[PDB]
Design a protein around this ligand. Structure first.
Ligand SMILES: [Mg+2]
Ligand SMILES: [Mg+2]
Ligand SMILES: [Mg+2]
Ligand SMILES: [Mg+2]
Ligand SMILES: [Mg+2]
Ligand SMILES: [Mg+2]
Ligand SMILES: [Mg+2]
Ligand SMILES: [Mg+2]
Ligand SMILES: [Mg+2]
Ligand SMILES: [Mg+2]
Ligand SMILES: [Mg+2]
Ligand SMILES: [Mg+2]
Ligand SMILES: [Mg+2]
Ligand SMILES: [Mg+2]
Ligand SMILES: [Mg+2]
Ligand SMILES: [Mg+2]
Ligand SMILES: [Mg+2]
Ligand SMILES: [Mg+2]
Ligand SMILES: [Mg+2]
Ligand SMILES: [Mg+2]
Ligand SMILES: [Mg+2]
Ligand SMILES: [Mg+2]
Ligand SMILES: [Mg+2]
Ligand SMILES: [Mg+2]
Ligand SMILES: [Mg+2]
Ligand SMILES: [Mg+2]
Lengths: 53, 96, 89, 168, 57, 107
RNA sequence: AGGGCACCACCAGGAGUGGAGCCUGCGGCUUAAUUUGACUCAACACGGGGAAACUCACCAGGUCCAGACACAAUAAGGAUUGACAGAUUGAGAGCUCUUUCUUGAUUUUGUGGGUGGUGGUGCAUGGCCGUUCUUAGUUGGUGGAGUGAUUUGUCUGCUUAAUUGCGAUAACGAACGAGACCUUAACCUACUAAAUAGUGGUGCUAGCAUUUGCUGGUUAUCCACUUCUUAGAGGGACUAUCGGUUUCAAGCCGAUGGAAGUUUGAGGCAAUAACAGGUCUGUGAUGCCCUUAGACGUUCUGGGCCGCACGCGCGCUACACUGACGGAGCCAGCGAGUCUAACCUUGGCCGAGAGGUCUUGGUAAUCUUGUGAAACUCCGUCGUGCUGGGGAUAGAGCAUUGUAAUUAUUGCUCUUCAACGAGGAAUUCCUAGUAAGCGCAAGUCAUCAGCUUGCGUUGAUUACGUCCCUGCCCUUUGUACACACC
């Protein structure tokens, strides 16, 4: 009942966030991950993205 | 501010009739899953109950898990005016 | 009275030919020059931190007679309770 | 449910990595060492490697009915289509995750670092390991940070056998 | 800021006893929540009717 | 209920190859003892999911990168199976870490 | 001082960059703001930082409390809430007033205590990462020397990519690091096969020219095979063999064989010690401090990061004939992709073009997609002219995305056609499918690539050396230095 309080959030950096830490920049969107580039390196091995070469 | 009585009860009944509530760290969501009230209301009724004991709060990847304590449920029996100590709410309820 | 975008078209000394006549200051040919890091090892706080404050938190070499001879004991007692909680009683 | 295999495997890798950190936080004081999720039809069951299992199950299903209702509500599982099981970590002194949480409840409860580290290093060696190394960094009554390794045994730092043999 | 909330009795009815029957005007209408709203200046405060409210008292 | 070929395909997708080809061997071993005719484990090309990030969390240092790789291995086995005895011996011991889907067709 | 090592050093060369025009980052200047962090290598197309809103931290203005909880007043004679229209306001914010309804211990007002903060401190810190250093270095057991700190081992020489070994030996025998290991690429006419890959007949057709060449089609409307492809399990190379040299060592070089004889190519991992390297602005990592309602919280509207006398960095487009244009030939590889909703898009139609519309296939070895990609090749037109090279600037119109395109988001069609005639001082990268030319996919992405991470196409010159320059390492010497020449 308070019309004034929102704006479009349907495209761009503010439309999405990291699902861990709510950051907007550095977000990895590949394979539907929605995890920033620093939380992904924390969580690479227990997602399955191990590193070989 | 004013969160009305029919919104606070339906938060409080569900925490008695489920025993845990999850919520999201995303305000202005305005309707909780499984409760007919705002996501602002369920966070701030259960941040309120956490301060007076009664609820243990965990955050864990943006989604606000709340677990009821033992001193919490005995508050919610004199609040919601249930029969005395018959219904436990609701961990050991149906299959035990 | 006129102000804003209407006065900008009729303002004098605004525009490229006016600014090209004015020479370039020597602040445009400068850099940070290490951002005050030539004295990084020589600390600018000036503590020379005491022996007592480092020895009493981070261990002292004169107590290693007492240090490991108890840390052997609880580790052995942690073994002595881990096997005891395996399938005893 | 009409989702690609590149997406469905990654999403299950994210559901694993979320419950790893959730049960890290919620089951911290009960010796959680790992979670194991088995994707079967008609039910998924959550296997919890908790060293002291007897309080994870709580009393009479409390704290295991609760974690059942917790994971079925965040991830929106249907009621009864997920169940949680707690089985205890054997060879407990060869798990770094259970021993990093053990040293955490040494250092917060008020025990010195040299007594805590040699407590858990020589627990690892007396529990049957080839090598152990505890590195503690931070500040302890001194402003300037220092690090000290408490290494006893035998370690290999280079190559694939880091991945084969070392719990970090 | 907000209303002074005068310590009021029932308003917008004339009386009950005064010579010698009920004197209460504005015969009943279709609004249940019949009832008196806020009249400022030839307009009344529409609060209940969700879509249609066509009366300008 | 009486020994009719159903033309079923079991597709098996899994990150780890040893646990995947364990079940793709057991699907072969199950259908070589019921004497069922089968097109065997057809080894689809390995999906390699590569993600390149800068090493540093901030923007300092040399420009150094990781390649975090997920390998997806996939197989399918075609079958023509008497359904009730084969569905009895396939739904049992579902393997974790291997995703298995069973599709029938009308061909 | 001696001796080593390395195209982040040189030699011999290649290709550049520095000169020009733009693109972007930095400093500065300007500004309401032009948010900031980072300043030799290790700051500067770096923060994945290609910012119209959001991001956003900055600036000009407006909301809201999302101020938990405890205690005391205020209250049910109502503590408080939300509003119609007008004023007000960018605002269709009851923000606030006029107005008079609504509403009901959910509050209001203070004192504590919290919450929040992309606010400060990377000189309080964790974690991560950069550099030393991709260097070869590090350590204990017993024995020897020394009162001892310590030392010898762990080294004069030769070799190696390597403290890699051989050898010398008061040391002997080992451990971490190097290597082994793991991944990827190159071989397998040997196995296991497959309509989600092909090949061969033809079950079976059906075409064109013909008398078999090129085709198009069906796998209980066929059968067979695995060479090609895939991926399981294996095999292969170990410098094999033979010569030459070496202390007949360790090795190195040549030849032959071989898929491979540069650690087979290339990465991943990578010790001990650190640096006052960076990051508090990645996190609900965090101590302490600052603020907390007239906010540094959050949100809304608009601006700003892009503002332009200028200095610098990485680049993109060229100076043309080994080249531009037009036609024609026409060939890859790594990805990604939608109902857990609008993604990759074939085909048809409309349009110069951009694009539009009607359908379709695909959750993908199945469809986009043979990604019919670009350089390249051939045949034409040009003809040494700043020219038909170059396409900067600038004008006019048409589309797309988006709530919104102005300071041009981008594309399209016409026009304008700037410097630039191969670049002082200096300086970067590089030893074989490598340099370089070429473009494609992914990332961020609603739109925007002169950017990066890969990928394939085309594919040379020059050396298989050295300490000459630079940087690093070790030994000897010196020291009145050990917050260790800051
Ligand atoms: Mg950022
Ligand atoms: Mg060891
Ligand atoms: Mg080793
Ligand atoms: Mg190695
Ligand atoms: Mg030269
Ligand atoms: Mg230039
Ligand atoms: Mg600026
Ligand atoms: Mg700073
Ligand atoms: Mg960039
Ligand atoms: Mg804004
Ligand atoms: Mg914060
Ligand atoms: Mg802020
Ligand atoms: Mg020794
Ligand atoms: Mg000795
Ligand atoms: Mg020595
Ligand atoms: Mg083959
Ligand atoms: Mg520092
Ligand atoms: Mg510093
Ligand atoms: Mg707000
Ligand atoms: Mg910028
Ligand atoms: Mg630069
Ligand atoms: Mg041409
Ligand atoms: Mg192809
Ligand atoms: Mg011209
Ligand atoms: Mg933009
Ligand atoms: Mg792109």
């Amino acid at each position: 009942e308070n019309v004034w309080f929102s704006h479009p959030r349907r495209y761009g950096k503010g439309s999405r966030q990291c699902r861990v830490c709510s950051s907007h920049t550095g977000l990895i969107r590949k394979y539907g991950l929605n995890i920033c580039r620093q939380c992904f390196r924390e969580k690479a091995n227990d997602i399955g993205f191990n590193k070989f070469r | 501010m004013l969160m009305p009585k029919e919104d606070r009860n339906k938060i409080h009944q569900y925490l008695f009739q489920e025993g845990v509530v999850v919520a999201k760290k995303d305000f202005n969501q305005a309707k909780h899953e499984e409760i007919d009230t705002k996501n602002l209301y369920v966070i701030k009724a259960l941040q309120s109950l956490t301060s007076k004991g009664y609820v243990k709060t965990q955050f864990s990847w943006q989604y606000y898990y709340y677990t009821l304590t033992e001193e919490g449920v005995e508050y919610l029996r004199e609040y919601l005016n249930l029969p005395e100590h018959i219904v436990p709410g609701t961990y050991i309820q149906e299959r035990n | 009275r006129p102000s804003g975008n209407e006065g900008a078209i009729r303002d004098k000394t605004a525009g490229r030919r006016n600014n090209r006549s004015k020479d370039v200051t020597d602040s445009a040919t400068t850099k940070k020059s290490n951002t005050r890091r030539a004295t990084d090892r020589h600390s600018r706080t000036g503590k020379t931190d005491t022996k007592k404050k480092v020895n009493q938190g981070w261990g002292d070499d004169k107590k290693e007679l007492s240090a490991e001879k108890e840390a052997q004991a609880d580790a052995a007692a942690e073994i002595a309770e881990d096997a005891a909680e395996a399938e005893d009683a | 449910a009409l989702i690609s295999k590149k997406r469905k495997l990654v999403a299950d890798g994210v559901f694993y990595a979320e419950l790893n950190e959730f049960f890290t936080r919620e089951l911290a004081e009960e010796g959680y060492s790992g979670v194991e999720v088995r994707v079967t039809p008609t039910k998924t069951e959550v296997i919890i490697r908790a060293t002291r299992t007897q309080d994870v199950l709580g009393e009479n299903g409390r704290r295991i009915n609760e974690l059942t209702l917790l994971v079925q509500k965040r991830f929106k599982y249907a009621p009864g289509t997920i169940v949680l099981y707690a089985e205890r970590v054997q060879d407990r002194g060869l798990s770094a995750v259970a021993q990093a949480e053990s040293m955490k409840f040494k250092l917060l409860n008020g025990l010195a670092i040299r007594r805590a580290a040699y407590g858990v290093v020589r627990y690892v060696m007396e529990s049957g390991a080839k090598g152990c190394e505890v590195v503690v960094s931070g500040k302890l009554r001194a402003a300037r940070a220092k690090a000290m390794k408490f290494a006893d045994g035998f370690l290999i730092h280079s190559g694939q056998p880091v991945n084969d043999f070392i719990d970090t | 800021h907000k209303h002074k909330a005068v310590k009021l009795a029932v308003l917008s009815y004339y009386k009950v006893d005064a010579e010698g029957k009920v004197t209460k005007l504005r015969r009943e209408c279709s609004n249940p929540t019949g009832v008196f709203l806020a009249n400022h200046k030839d307009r009344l405060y529409c609060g209940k009717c969700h879509s249609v409210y066509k009366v300008n008292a | 209920q009486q020994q009719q070929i159903i033309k079923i395909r079991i597709t098996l997708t899994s990150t780890k190859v040893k646990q995947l080809e364990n079940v793709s061997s057991n699907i072969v071993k199950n259908a070589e003892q019921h004497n069922l005719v089968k097109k065997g484990p057809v080894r689809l090309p390995t999906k390699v999911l590569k993600i390149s990030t800068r090493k540093t969390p901030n923007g300092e240092g040399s420009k150094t990168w990781e390649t975090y790789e997920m390998r997806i291995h996939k197989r399918y086995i075609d079958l023509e199976a008497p359904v009730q005895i084969v569905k009895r011996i396939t739904q049992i011991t579902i393997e974790p870490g291997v995703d298995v889907e069973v599709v029938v067709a009308s061909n």
